[model samples]
Structures are given as C-alpha cells and as structure tokens.
Target: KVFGRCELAAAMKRHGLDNYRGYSLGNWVCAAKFESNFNTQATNRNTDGSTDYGILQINSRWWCNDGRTPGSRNLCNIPCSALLSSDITASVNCAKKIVSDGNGMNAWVAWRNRCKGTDVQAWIRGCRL
Candidate 1:
C-alpha cells in the first residue's frame, strides 16, 4: 500500500499525471479511492466472471491476460498479476495507456458514478501536493 494520499499524489505528479489528459489530480485521487480504497493489491470479480485487477481495477477482458481467461486483448502486454502490487508503476503505466486510448477517466466506472460532475475538492484537500 502507498504511505498516504500525499504519497500517491506525489508519485503521480512525478509521473506528470497531476493534471493529465485534461483531468484534474482530484479526479485521479477520487477514482483510486473509490476503485480500490488505495489498495494496490485489490481485485474484484465481475458478475460476468471476468475480474478487475489492481488499484485501478483494470479488466482482464481487454487490458491483461491472467492465463486463465479465454480471450484477452492484452493491449498493455502485461500480466494481470503485475498490477496487483505495492509498486504502482505497472498499474499506472497501463492506466496511462488506457486513458490515452480515448477512454479518458470515464474508463473507470467509479469516476462516472462518484467523482464525475461532483465537487471533488475534498479529494485533494489538505494533501497540499
């Protein structure tokens, strides 16, 4: 897990994602919070039997190959296990590609449901990053 919210923010900023792709830093924070509650090792199984992996909950259907799933585009060319780690470099990199693929932050359902169109100031409040 990351040390804290500021730690995550600082890491993201260092990667030039503080305000990436016309999205605010708060948007990233809000999405991460809702998706995994900051747990990089997080994973969730969908009703469709596919699973979401890591802090961003990337899907096995497209982004990765778990070796068990039948068909995966594996567009990121990464194993799903790589995303479930304390080091978010892989996850963040994959996420970057995902956003750049034109999905935007809307790729994350959490963003659309919780972070979108809301006053997300609290997501970055007091972090001072």
Candidate 2:
C-alpha cells in the first residue's frame, strides 16, 4: 500500500492539499490514492509517453528533462505535464509551486477548471485505497 489512511491523512494535512473542510482535499486524496496509493516507490510504464513514480507519481521523463544527467540529484522540480507531457504529481508540483506559492494543493485549479466537471471522477472512483 502507498500509505495507510492515517498516513495519507497526515501527509495531506502536513501538505495542506486538502482543505479540511470541503471536497477539495478529498478529491486530492482520491487523486493521490488512485495515482500511486501514496507509495513513494510506486512506478508504472506508460506507452503514452508518460512516466509514473513515487508518492507523487513523478514522471521519469519529466524529471529527466531540464538537462539532468544520469543519477543527478533533484536540482529542482517542475510540473508533470511540462516535464513529460504526462501528469505526474511531483513534477506537477514543481510547476505548480510557481503559482501555488509552495502549496501543492493549489494546483487543483487545473483540475477544477479543466478536468473536474469531466469524467475524471468517474474514472477514478472506487480506485484502490
């Protein structure tokens, strides 16, 4: 499992991804839960040219770009989409920080505005915990 509910709750709390009063946090938790189960070691291969890794499900290509050589320490972070044309959380956060002011949850603006009213929820509902 990526994380226990308590662990996820704590992580979300610490990161302030969830609003603690509304559905935003729940939605973010669901996204993370579905993405990698909050597992830092989680990884997936995508034929669609997207990478999957870590609790935030960072894309390999996304992190690999920006002139990083093999085995380079994370010099910095950027958005998953900008990183690899895929949606990885850590990479997404990297780009998100520019507007979020260091808050990962604030990236939800993309979700709420572009994806929320779509089929994303239907696709992820009842996903693994």
Candidate 3:
C-alpha cells in the first residue's frame, strides 16, 4: 500500500511514532517519505546482500530475518516478509525497536541523508496532526 503524505503522518502518530524517543512527528514522517515513499511493500537490496524491508525499510542484516541474509541477527524477532504487510503495525513496532536499540532514528541512512537537519515540518505540512 502506498500512503499519501498525510495518510502516513496520521498513521505514524497513531502508532506512537510521533515524539518517540524525542523525535518529532515530522521527523518520523520525513524519514518514511524518503525511505520507501510510504510504500508498505517496498524492498531494496543493499550492496552487502542485506535487503531493506517494508515502509521503513528495516534491514535484514540486523533487524529482520529474511532467511537469506546468512545468520541475520533478526533483532526484531520478526520475519522480514512480515514487514511487507499493508498494515504497518509490525513494521512500526520494529522501527521503535530500532530506535530504542541505541541506533535511534538515524538507523536508516535515508533518514540521515534526507530528513536529518531539515525543517521536517514541511514533510507533514497539510496534516492536521
């Protein structure tokens, strides 16, 4: 499922991502905007053969187990495939895990590159929030 910008913002807020770990709602929305364009089924194969999964693109190498990453840590204890579900509960929870696991919101390079240090409010401009 591809979410419109505000649609994703609302969902993120509902899932407790807003102000999670002190990161603003807009920061979360901006990360999702660049990570997978708010796509639930998005997957991208990394250079190291670790695939990033789901809307937040949780990584197989350390986050989810895809059964192909060769001894993946699977720290989220969830199958990478589960991240593809249109319902983002699992993906959002896994993202929280990533944030709390000392990685924080900068775990995704997309966030670091595209969302970090920006006025993230623009990412959710029209959202009532």
Candidate 4:
C-alpha cells in the first residue's frame, strides 16, 4: 500500500514537526485508517446512497467544481493532493487542511493529543503499517 515508504519517510524527516515523530505519523496513519482504510480505490456513498467517490473518499457527484477535467469522480480517479503531489509539502499541507475542517492542523493536533497517552507506535505496527 505504501509504494513510497522510503520517500514518505524522507518527506517526514524533512517536513515533520520535531519532537512529534513518535506521535505524528501514527496519528496520520490512524486518520487514514479512519478515512479510507488506506485504499486509494476506496469510495463512499452518502446516506441518500447517491454520491460515490474515491480515496480520501472524495465525493464526485458533488463538491468538485474546478474541472481540470469534467465530472466529480474524474479527480477521484487520482490520489488526493494529500496523498500524492509533486510538492510533498503541499500534499501534507492539503491534509492539514482537511484535518483542520477548513481551519488548519489544529484538528490534527487534537487527534494526536487524544492518542497521546496510548502506545501510538504499537497501534501503527499492529494496525496501520
């Protein structure tokens, strides 16, 4: 699933917050688990059972407006900017945006704090990685 763990690791080392590795990546993987179970092909449907979408479970029937190509699911065929982009910083920043719920990384930090007392690495090894 991690086609670029090494590169991701390098990106982490380069862009990750200091003193938080023991916590940050674990939380990230946790959120990904919660969001899409790490499946880029994953899709979700709305309660109305109308919308369908892909990784990060981005809904295609709605929400998509900037049409570099037509259709909502078109972009869904590609990884979210959070998952893949030429700019790793931008990618992770986009993640921070989602996590913030339009606010920023504060939501991410909240999630991290929620898991702070537990064995985060153990959770990562046992479930996420």
Q: In terms of lDDT, which candidate is stronger, 2 or 4?
A: 2
Candidate 1: tens digits of C-alpha lDDT, residues 20-90 = 78878888888888998888888898776778998789988888888766655798999999999888888
On a 0 to 1 TM-score scale, where does candidate 2 land against the true structure?
Answer: 0.47
Model 1 scores a C-alpha lDDT of 0.83
Taking the tens digit of each residue's C-alpha lDDT, what string does model 2 give over 40-97? 5566665655455555454445343433333433424543334333223443355234
lDDT of 1 at 72: 56
TM-score to true structure, per model = 0.92, 0.47, 0.96, 0.42
- lDDT, candidate 2, equals 0.46
Question: What do the candidate models score in CA lDDT, each in turn?
Answer: 0.83, 0.46, 0.89, 0.41
**What stretches of model 3 exceed 4 Å from their correct place?**
none
Worst 10 residues of 3 by lDDT: 101-110
Highest lDDT: which candidate?
A: 3
Candidate 4, position 3, lDDT: 23
Any runs in candidate 2 off by more than 4 Å, and if so which?
19-23, 48-50, 63-75, 78-129
Q: Model 3: C-alpha RMSD to truth? A: 0.9
Q: Rank the candidates by lDDT, best first.
A: 3, 1, 2, 4
Cα lDDT tens digits, model 4, 1-129, are 332433433454466632252335655544444444544444454564433322234433433322332344432233333333334453344443354454333343434454445554543453322
| Top TM-score prediction, candidate number | 3
